Amino acid sequence: SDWDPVVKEWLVDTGYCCAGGIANAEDGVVFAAAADDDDGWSKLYKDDHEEDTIGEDGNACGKVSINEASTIKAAVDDGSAPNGVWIGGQKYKVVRPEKGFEYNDCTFDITMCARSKGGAHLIKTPNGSIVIALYDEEKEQDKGNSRTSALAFAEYLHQSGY
After folding, report:
1. Contacts within 8 Å (CB) and 24+ apart, 155-160
2. What CATH number corresponds to the domain at position 81?
3. Which GO terms fall under molecular function for this chain's record (predicted)?
């Protein structure tokens, strides 16, 4: 089960994502990671970290301990994260969930998350893997090509029984 090279060849080598990974849908915990600089784990995971909570006016109104896996599972399961989706220490917003999206004869729950000048696709397979695919608009990447890349990989995971 040496997953990191598989993530790399599917999501990073193809050039549409700057980093990627897979998490267990049961708990949101990333178990595989890869990146364009071979430090995928730093891009996909950070141990629980304190962050600002934000009021409706966008201002900081307190603090909260973030467990990244919890935020990933929330985004996927609920289409909602109370304090943002945090991946590798970076905050994203849930911008567009789609349940049961049809791709290549299979359905996937997808959640698009955005940050400034980049984003992340979270794609759940029938067997409870979550593909995580990150793109960086500063690296000439875009949400469309990265989504297709993420779907192709999710479907490979599906066809492989994950």
Report:
1. 155/103, 155/104, 155/106, 155/108, 156/10, 157/22, 157/125, 157/127, 157/129, 157/131, 158/106, 158/108, 158/125, 158/126, 158/127
2. 3.30.450.30
3. actin monomer binding; phospholipid binding
Give the chain's length: 162
Of the chain, the end-to-end C-alpha distance in Å amounts to 12
Residues spanned by the domain of 109: 1-162
Q: Which residue type sits at 5?
A: P
Tokens 């969930």 correspond to 97
Q: In the structure encoding, which two tokens stand for residue 55, read together?
A: 């009021």
Sheet holding 90-103, edge to edge: 30-35, 19-24, 129-136, 118-124, 106-115, 90-103, 85-87
What are the backbone dihedrals phi and psi of residue 22, each rounded to the nearest 5 degrees, phi first? -140, 140
Please name the residue that has the structure tokens 């970076």. Answer: 90
Closest CA to 160 of 32, 34, 13: 32
